[PDB]
Structures are given as structure tokens and as C-alpha cells.
Amino acid sequence: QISVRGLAGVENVTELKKNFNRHLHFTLVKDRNVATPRDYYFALAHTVRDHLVGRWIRTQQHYYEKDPKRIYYLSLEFYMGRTLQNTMVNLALENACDEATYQLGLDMEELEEIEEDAGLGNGGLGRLAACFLDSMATLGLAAYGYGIRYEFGIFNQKICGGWQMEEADDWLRYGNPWEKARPEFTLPVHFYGRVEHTSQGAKWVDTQVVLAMPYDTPVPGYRNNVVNTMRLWSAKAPNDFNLGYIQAVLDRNLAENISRVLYPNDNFFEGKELRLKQEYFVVAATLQDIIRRFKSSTNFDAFPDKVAIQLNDTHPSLAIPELMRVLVDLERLDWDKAWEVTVKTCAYTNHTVLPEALERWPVHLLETLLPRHLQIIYEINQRFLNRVAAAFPGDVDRLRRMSLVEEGAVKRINMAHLCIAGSHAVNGVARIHSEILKKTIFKDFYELEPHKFQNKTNGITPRRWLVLCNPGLAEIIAERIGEEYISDLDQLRKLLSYVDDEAFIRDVAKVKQENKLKFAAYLEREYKVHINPNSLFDVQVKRIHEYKRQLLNCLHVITLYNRIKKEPNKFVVPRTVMIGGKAAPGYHMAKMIIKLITAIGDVVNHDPVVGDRLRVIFLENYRVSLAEKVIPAADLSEQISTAGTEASGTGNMKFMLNGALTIGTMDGANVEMAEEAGEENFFIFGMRVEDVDRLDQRGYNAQEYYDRIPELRQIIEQLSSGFFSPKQPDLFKDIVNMLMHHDRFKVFADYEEYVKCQERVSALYKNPREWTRMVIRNIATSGKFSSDRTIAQYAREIWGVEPSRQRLPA
Template sequence: MPKPLTDQEKRKQISVRGLAGVENVSDLKTNFNRHLHFTLVKDRNVATKRDYYFALANTVRDHLVGRWIRTQQHYYEKDPKRVYYLSLEFYMGRTLQNTMVNLALENACDEATYQLGLDMEELQDIEEDAGLGNGGSGQENPHLISPSPPPVLSACFLDSMASLGLAAYGYGIRYEFGIFNQKIVNGWQVEEADDWLRYGNPWEKARPEYMRPVHFYGRVEHTPDGVKWVDTQVVLALPYDTPVPGYRNNVVNTMRLWSAKAPCDFNLKDFNVGGYIQAVLDRNLAENISRVLYPNDNFFEGKELRLKQEYFVVAATLQDIVRRFKSSKFGSTEVVRVDLSTLPDKVSGHPAERHPPSPDMGEGTVLVPLLKQKCCTKNRSPLPLTISFYMHLCVLPLSQAWDIVTRTCAYTNHTVLPEALERWPIDLFQNLLPRHLEIIFEINRRHLERIANLYPGDHDRLRRMSLVEEGDQKKINMAHLCIVGSHAVNGVARIHSDIIKATLFKDFYEVDPHKFQNKTNGITPRRWLVMCNPGLAEVIAERIGEDYIRDLDQLKNLLEFVDDDSLIRDIAKVKQENKLKFSAYLEEHYKVKINPNSMFDVQVKRIHEYKRQLLNCLHIITLYNRIKKEPNKNWTPRTIMIGGKAAPGYHTAKLIIRLITAVGDIVNHDEVVGDRLKVIFLENYKVTLAEKIIPASDLSEQISTAGTEASGTGNMKFMLNGALTIGTMDGANVEMAEEAGEENLFIFGMRVDDVDAMDKSGYDAMEYYNRIPELKLAMDQIAGGYFSPDQHDLFKDIVNMLLHHDRFKVFADYEAYIKCQDKVSALYKNPKEWTKMVIHNIAGCGKFSSDRTISQYAREIWGMEPSLERIPAPDDPRQ
């Protein structure tokens, strides 16, 4: 029997036509050895595998540099409108393989490393994930000085912006420690620091010449000469640039991440009184701003460090934006723009996550809140970001400055969960950013004045729409500030956009309905198909050509082959090869042997009550009990895999992980069950693991309570890679069902209207518990210690929550979920019909390309047009 092709060999089969100037294998080998010798100062006698990885990375980077410089020169010469995508998180994953795919270098690099006696996959595995975001796996959203989406989503968007030829820049924080590494110890999550920079990062370039000051604390002086923010503490923002290549169009955009540095004279006045050592140690207080990523997602935590991080990235970025705006070239004339009123014509700001106001840009300038914020991201709690500008060289009245803000900024909301929306205590704001708080108060006064004129006497509406929430502790509602400071507001799936108009931001929608839009999220097919699933990418290319990689709508042409036995056979074969490969990975890394012919039933995402991993767990227990009761029945074998990280302070989420591991311990060691059911918790889920598990999955669990998931992008990745979805009509599942046909997904449970009706009538979990025997048995087993024999009350908090305080109504969907899972098991026994349904799903994925999402943002919010023009490649890609 022939040996299966490796992923590299499969990708070699995909054509690389259309890319000029690719060096031959001999040149690649020469450059590899040159970097090993001159960059790493090693020879083959003493070099390690890590040295070889760095030599290869630098060799590939050589091919980026010329294109990177050429792209920036092109933007300078043409002076297009630019979009700035701000996000506190960019879950980029690994860079080497993605770069080789986008530059069509994989074939040559594979051959060069082979001739050098090296294994490409081993070298790729040495690269650390750039885990600069929370989230299931890593990509999320942008706008005009624009708020961006979730971390994973942010990474997809950057890829699409470059592939579409948009003049775009990603801005974020260069966290020294990214999202924590998760270890499972005795069934519990344990967090370890993610020291991803400990060996260096070959893809970044420090740019100290563009360092910017960011101010904190201090006080405000009102004098006859104007308002001054004085006695501030200054932190320097040092930028590190990373290239972001488009797909085979020679465009290389920039992601700029800021690192906090204390100025040289930071507190050194203490030296005069003998406090030199302490003064130097205190520098850490300033530099802690970029030390660590906040590991909370979908839960707002009002910590001073978090507000500092938000303000830090916005303040530094806005200064950089204005610097670039002022230095421009018109034809052959270099000029310095001083009229900031034209800023919206050249700048589109789209903030992602939460971002606050910004810093002083010069002496005697007026502070102006210029920009908006964005709320939440897919893998991050919906957090708005407020952006304020100090206008430099030109003193503008607040009304004119605010007009510039609203024309420049757009706001994307990424959550409807109230605990995830950002509300900053006024006392904290007053201490950290006193001048910005004054401006927010003035913006709020003018905003409420307008509302009062529109709705005379409606004091309750004024209270609901105020930017300042009253109560025991006054707070700034950042989502409200974002809406008021933006010309466009959007949700990230149609159902989500409808919900925010009908509930969350109903008052604002009634006042400014023209502002509200929908932009359904998407994923990049380059990373999430061509790179991670080359076998499937090639099978598709054989039938419909390769252009679908740039135009995912062409996948609908697969419907012509839905009854083609050869396509059905080829897709099933690719899936089985992926499952065999992942089974070997699990056996090596998890020391567990699974049945590769079983159904791979997968739920990977953040661990959160609204994601309802508990509903999945109840199905596992029910299936286990059924097999125990009828061991001789012809059961469909399943390997159920759940993965994701819980925020370190989220007790319930960590207890959910413990329950999953406890159930797995019992199920996996029960000889009666055997390999008909296995339960695995996937430790330390991240982008690199997602790239392995998603292509191998048969069933994708997207089972959140209807009306709680903004969109989801993991659901799209599974769909594109040939997994069928079991899910509620929530988030993007609704549109996935429309595109593929609802009959080609396993849809179950309450719809949004049903949930709303239940909220009004009241949800009684005990009614379901007493009425459904299988549910009662499962809950009694959890409560009685069946899965925790050494500590019977271990899961009492989960039991109490499900029975008495469950906001997400797990029991209400239990019956429908179990019946739907029975349909899944029945269909899986018919491989041909299962695969035909898979083909329908893949063919329906066109809408869910991030290229489509970004094109809509560009045309409908940013006022830009995507370009299919290719920038000429440098004559020598090493230059």
C-alpha cells in the first residue's frame, strides 16, 4: 500500500503559477547557509534545530523585505486612504508556513530543506505561536481608525486586507507574555506563563525612530490661556513592525505592536537623595503596561492596568496616524498637511476590543477626543475603545474636533453579554486620565442636550442613553461613547445585528437608524484551508480550479459534483487521512489511543457558560449510560474532544473543565464501553492545535444559547474543512444554514424568540429535571459523586447553577439536543450520504471568507475600494 503523502507533498500539488521572481532551490540553500553563518554565527557542526529554524525564517523573510518596502513606497506615492485596525489582541499563530504559502515559496523551501538534510515539519514545529490574544483559535475584526474584532478574527482580517490590496495597518500591544499556556494537572486547569519571546522573534523589526510618548495621571489646569494637562507620568511606546503578506500579489502590509518603555529620566530625581536603585526598579511599573495579556474573555474586569493598556495603544497609535497623515506626497511635491479637517478623507479608524483616549502631541495643543472605540471581539469580551486626540499644529473647537471623530471612526460590537461590556469607574478615569474625563463629560452634555430636544420630557430615555451611568458608583459606558463617536455601528452576524438594534442599543437605533449595519464575520481561506488542509484544497482545485482561494464564492461550483462518486471518495479519503494523522498526534502527545474510524465530535472554544460545554457534557453522560444499559447494541463510535481555556478567575469555567476531565476518566476506563466512546480534553488549545484538529473533525459543536453568540468564526473553519455542524440558530449558524441549506446542518433547540418568551414566562430548570429521566440520572450522577468518587460534592456549584441559576437554559435544549445527536449517529453510519452533506457545506462557505467581510467594510464603512492590482515584485526579492 503506498505511503500517504505528507502535508508538504500535498501543498506542492497546488499550482504556484503567477508569482514572478521566485529564487531557485540553489539560491535558497545559499541564503540559508549565509544566515546560519552570518546572522546566527553558527556552522553545521554546532547548530541546533532552533538555529536551523531561524536560518530558514530569515531566508523566507528576505523575500518579504523587498515587497514590504515596495508596498510602503507605493502607498507613499499614491497616497490612498488608509485603514487603521486597532486591536488589543492579534492571535496570529505561527508565521513561517503562512508566509511561504502566501509567497508561493513552499515548494522551493521544501526541496531546499530536504537537500540540506532537514525536515520542514520539524523546523515549523519549533516556532512559537504568537499567542497575543484570547479566543478559541485566533482571528477577528476592523474599521476606519477603526475598532477591530476578536484576536483570531483580527489576524484573518489583516490577511484579507493585504490580499485585497488595501492600504491597511494593524496596531496592538507587543505583550511580553501572551495568553497563558494551559496545563491540566489532576483534571484541573493550571496556568503557566507564555514566554513566547524568550528565543527572539525573527519576523519583527524594532522601530525606535517612531517611539511615541504616552501620558498618564497628572492634573488639569484651567488658565486664561487654555486648558493644560500637567505633571503627567510619561511612558514611551516603542513600535515593533511585523510584515503581513497578501496572497501572491506582492503586497506586504504592516502590523505595528507597541512595547512600553520608561524614559531614561524616569524618577531619577530620586538619585539625588540616594534612591537610585529604587528609581531604576520603579521603571518596571511603567513597562508593566505591555508585560502581559489580560486572560479574561467575555468578562469585563475594571482594572487600572487594563485601562492603561487600552489608552496606551490608542494614544501611541493616534500619534502615529497623525504623523503619517501629515507627511504625504502629492505627485512630485512633498508637503506637510496641517488641516486636520481632511483627516476622514485619508484615514479610517476601526478599533477592536476596548480602547480609550489618547495623549498629548505637542506643547500648547488642545486635547480632543477624536475617535471611537469598539466593543468586544469574538474571543474577547466585547470591549469598546475610546480614542482621543490631541490636535497638533492646529487648535480646533470641540464641536469641529468631534465632527472629525465621528466621520473618521466606526464601531463594531462583538457581544451582547452585559458582563462583557466595558464600564469604567469615574474615580479610576479621573485618576488616570483626568483631562479625558472632562471631555467625556462635555461630550455627554451635548449628546443629552440633543436627545432632550428630540424627546422632550423623556427623562428615562436620557438616563438610559447617558454616557455616564449613575448608581452607587458612577461609570463611563464605553459602548455608548463608541456609538455617539462613530458614523457607523455594526454587529458581526445578521442575527446579532438585529438583536443589538432591537435590545442592546435600541434607543440609539431609534435616534440614528442610518448608523446601524451588519458585517458578518469571515475567515481567511489561506490559513484555514490551503495551509492547514492541503489535501482538501487540492481535491477542490482539481474540480473547480485554484481561483477559489481568492474568490471563495466559487466553491458553489462544487455542487455540480455533489453526486460524483469520485469526489465523494476523494473527500472522504482526505478526511480519513487527517483523522489518522491527528490520532497519531494524540497518541504521541496525550498518550491515549483512539479509534480513527470513530466519529470525531469536537467542541473547541473558550470555556464559558454561554458556550454550553455543559450541554455537551450531559450528552456524553447520557450516551455513556445508554451504552452501559445496552452494551450489545450497534452504537456509532464517537471520540468526543473538548478544548479551550478558562479565564484564571472564572471559577465556574474552571469547574467545567474539571467535570469534563472527570467524566473522561470514568468513560475512558470503562471496559464495557471500550472504544465506542472516548472523551478527551484537548490541553492548551491554540492556533497551531486548531490547524490540526479542525481538518480532522467530523462534527462541529456550536451549541450556544440562541441570542448569545455574536457570530463565531470557529464554526466557519469547521464548515470549510468538511465537518458538519450541530448547533442552535445562533450567531453565524443562521447564515450557514441559509448558505448550505438547513437540511445540511443539524439544527436543534430554541430560537431567539423562544428564549425571549421563556425569559418573560420564567425558566424552571426543575421542571425539566423532574420530567426527563435521562437528564435526571445524569444530574444525579454528577451530584452524587459518580464521576468524583474521592470528593462527592466536588461539582455541587455546577449542579446548583444548572438547577437554580442557569442564565443559558441548558436543560431547556437538552431533549432537542439529544434527539439531534441521535440523527447525527444514524447518518454517520451512511458514509456516502454524510459526505454528500459535507460537500453541500463546503460549497456553501463562500460567504464566510474574510475577503468578503473586509470588502464590505471597505466599501460600506471605510469608503475604500479593494484593489486587485499587484504591486510589481522587486527584481531581487532579497533587497
């Protein structure tokens, strides 16, 4: 079919066919006469899995013999999505399998659609972890992902009457062929109890035990025969647990609840006990595993030469005092030596700046749950503050600002402070974010230890986010510059020499149009909704939060609507405006925003005077598999967070790679993206960070904008008076109230510039040749945003290991 999908050699195809039939018969216990498409999917998945395992066993064997430094990536989230196609791509099996299935009378694309997303994350942070695992394997690093195997991942979103409803994501219902249970490597985790001081140091006693059972999933690198491991822990009760009889057995559920469900909140901290248990559970089990593997190569001086532990935000921050606990209490190292080892082993990545996102755990929770860890934390704090006092003598306010312990009605532990003190490296996730960290929020820490602070700008894997989801674009690129760019994305820069090539312009535009038709058809089939596929596809997909300003997009949409109603017989560039994303279940304002988006659509989409010129669509249940469909179909990428709020973004990079132009603020990685493509090839608008600060100094008054902008005033009057909610006229009064009086993200302040910038987008879209030339300039400069680049930087500058592009033997 296409070149970038590998060879379909006669013998490979024959062997895949016979193994497919072997798994259908023996593994699934089905004959051909009763097998459903789901059975056929599983037969294929098992067939493809068999090609992994030889490489998996060999890879892990090689690491045991060579004993390289090991990288442990600790995260509460891994948003993996589907595995079947990714595995085929990485093993060069895609064309052989397509042919093998074709010859059995099956359509492989249809079978790929049956696979559940592994939805073990909320959004950007969890998906970054997934991209990183892919890049680590592709770069030959001896890396392990460690997390929790949630029984229920991110909820499935249904819209009922324009409102979000949540349904449990029962992703394991039909089984997971990709994982292997390893109950033989089960480990104990302790909770509660009390601390006893003896002659022989501290002892943690009278604890409740929960077992941690590992499940291993293979992580294949791109065509290098390397298969790394993601190890996810599941919670099990011990068999003497509570041991009338019947009730004791049913109460085992209380222990197993720890790994039941992913907390569905992106960028907001909720201090629940169950969440703290999850955090300790993953840390405690993972560290025992790390230490046993280190001992099976008494001396912990070499520990940091053999182990790096990367903390994906503060969620696994308890790794720091847990490592200290093990080294001091169990291994009997003195404090100072243990601390040296811990700091050199641990590194911390920060992913936010909103004060409500920082983890600050009440002391009373830690006191009850993890009394030994609280003691270690106080000791860490005391020694740390002795260092601050010696460096800045007399600076008493600095001491309370830098403390790990926050004073107040409730005493709290600031986990970010703990991470900085206990790590040899601290990094933000985009250059502007890393600067903000050292200038404002961790300024005091930066002055004490400037050498700790780094930047590692985020990236995305070009395997999933180009080759897999946009094979048409990958192919036309491969026709011109070959295949090496897939594991060296900087080679896309060669495409600048095709910017005036008429054939390439035609092909880039044709691929986009095919992707748009394919997506428009998908909308009709699965959701009974029609769209004009010649319209500009204006897409904002990401989790729903105020700082992302889905509401600013809504204001633009209503502006275009009002303009059309005012001058119906004037030409305007047709648009399909698509907004998608999940709201956290407890977040009232985010749920109201979803309702507003669907309410706008109810008016706009049924106005006969609008025609097919404007459509507003809420994309239901946005998730990794839906991103793989909509991103290649997009013309315009909306990246419109208030400057200083989006730490990086990664969706922005996915769109850039797939031939959409970007409208956005100078926020997060948008700054670096514009810098790479040239500002003239980007639709930049709005306040910069400095402009936001100036506004905050004199005070943001929304009323001033309302008074000066007639078009904005009209929209606020329509919202208030019930134009978009005739049966419930006051339905949106909280939104209006927030915008006029309590808007932290300054929606009105960027309105005017956003609308003007949107007119420039429309003007360019009228000239397809120039639109497409600007697209080529974006794709061609997207190379920096490969996660291979990000990971190579972590490896050299933080972990002290060298990446490799060498094949292991097959």
C-alpha cells in the same frame, strides 16, 4: 509535491539553499556539526523573511507616493499564530523551500513545528483581527494593524489531576525573527497630572511619561506582492525616570509593566487600572503616529478623507476623546469642527451582548488617570443629551438610559455609549446579532440615528484555514475547479456540480480519513493517548464559558455512556468526543467544567464494557496551532450556545470549510451558515431567540425538566452522589446547584432536542456516501464566510475605499 504549493524551479531552490547556509553561519553563528532543529528553523525563517523585505519597503514606498486613504485597525489583540508557513504560502515559496530543505537533509514539517504561536489574543476577537489583516493585504488596502506587543501572551494551559494550571507564555525567549524594532520612532504617552485652564484653553500638566517603542511585523497579501504593517507598541521608561539610585533604576519596571501581559479574559469585563493604562497607551501612541503620517503628505477638513479608524470593540474607545483632545487642545480647532472630524473618522464594531462584558469604567479611575479625557467625555455627553432632548422632548427616562454617565453607588462611563455617539458607523458581527443590537440593547440609539447601524458578518481567511491547514482538501478542489477560489471563495459553489460524482465523493472522504489518522498519531506521540480513528470525531473547541454550554455536551456524553451500560450488546456508532479550551484564571465555574470533563473521561475511557465505542478527551492548551491540526480532522462541529449569546462565532466557519457537519442552535453566524447550505444540510436544534424570551417571561424552572426526563434525572443523581468523583463525593455540587437553581443559559431546556438531534447525526454517519454528499454541500456553500467578503464590505460601506486584486511589481 502538490499543485497549490507553487513551483520548485532549479534556480530558486539553489538560491534558497545558499541563503539558508549564509544565515546559519552569519546570522546564527553555528556550524552544521552543532546545529539543532531550532537553529535550522531560524535559518529558514530568516531566509524566507529576506523575500518579504523588498516587497515591504516597496509597498510602503508606493503608499507614500500615491497617498491613498489609510485604514487603521485598532485592537488590543492580534492572535497571529505561526508565521513561517503562512508567509511561504502567500509568496508562492512553499514547494521551493520544501525541496531546498529536502536537499539539505531536513524535513520542513518538523522545522515548522518548532515555531511558537504568537498568542497575543484570547480567542475569536483576536483571531478575527488576524484574519482581517490577511484579507486587507490580499485586497490591496493601505491598512495598518495597531496594538500592543505583550511580553507574555495568552497563558499555556497544563492539566494537573484534571485541573487547569496556568504557565506564562514566554514567546520571545528564543527571539522573534518576524518583527523589526523601530526605537527611532519612539513616542511619549502621558498619565496622571491635572488640568490647568488658561486664556489659551486647557493644558494637561504634571504628567508621568511612559515611552511607546514600536515593533513592526510584515503582513503579506496572497500572491499580490503587497506587504502591509502590523505595528505593536512596547512600554519603556524615560532615562530620567525617578532621577536611592539603585531603587530608581529598579522602579523602571513599574512603567514597563503596561505591556507585560495580555489580560486573559474572553467575554467578561474586569475594571483593573492596569487594563485601562493598556487601553490608553495603545490609543495615545497610535494617534500621534496617525497624525504625523497625515501631516507628511494645517487643514484637518481632509482628515476623514485620508484616515479611517476602526475600533475593535470598546477596548480602544479612548481614541474618541483622545482625538478630540489633540484637535482642541493642541491644534486649536473649535469644538464643533473637531467633533465633525472625529465622528467621520471613527467607526465601532460591537462583539457582545452579555451585560457583564460591557466596559463600564468607574469615574474615580478616569478622574485620577486621565483627568482631561474625563472632562471631554462630560462635554461630549452634555452635547449628545441636548440632541436627544430636542428629538424626544419630555422623554426623561430616555435621557438617563442614553447617558454616557451611569448613576449608582459608583458613577461609571459606559464606553459603548461613547463609541456610538462618536462614530459614523456601528456594526455587529452577524445578522442576528446586528438585529439584536437595534431591537434591544442599543434600541434608543437606533431610534435617534438609524443610519449608523450596519451588519458586517464575520469571516475567516481561506489561506490559513484551508490551504495552510488542509492541503489535501485544497488540492482535490483545485483538481476540479482550479486555483482562483483561494482569493475568491464564492467559486466553491462550482463544487455542487460534483455532488453525484463518485470519484470526488471518494476523494473528499479519503482526505478526511488521512487528516483523522494524522491527528490520531499526533495524539499518541505528544500526549500518550490512543483513539479509534474509525470513530466519529465529535469536536467542541472554544474558550470555556457557561454560554457556550460545554455542559450540555457533557450531559449528552453521560447519556450515551448510560445507554451503553444499560444495553451493552447493542450497536452504537463509535465516537471520540473531544472538548478543548482555556478558562479565564479567575472564573471558578469554568475551571470546574474542565474538571468535570476530565472526570467523565476517567470513568468512560477505563470502562471495559464501553470498549473503543466511546472516548472522551480533553484537548490541552487549545490555541491557533492546535486548531490547524484538529479542525481538518473533525466530523462533527459542536456550536451549541444558547440562542442570543454568541455574537457570531468564527470556529463554526473553520469547521464548515474543512468538511465537518455542524450541530448547533440558531445563534450568531450559524443562522447564516444554515441559510447558505440549506437547513436540510445542517443539524439544527433547540430554542430560537423568541423561545428563550418566552421562557424568561414566565420564568425558567429547571426542576420541571428534571421531573419530566428520567434520563436527565439519572445524570443529576450520578453527579450529586459522587459517581464521577468517588474520593470527593460532593466535588460537583456547585455545578448541580447552578443547573437546578441559577442557570442563565438554560442547559436543561435544550437537552431533549439536543439528544434527539445527536441520534440523527449518528444515523447519517452509518451511511458514509450520504454523510459525504452532505459535506460537499457544506463546503460548496462556505464562500460567504471568507474574510475577503467581510473586508470588501467594510471597505465600501464604512471606510469608503475600493478593494483591488492587482499585483504590485516584484
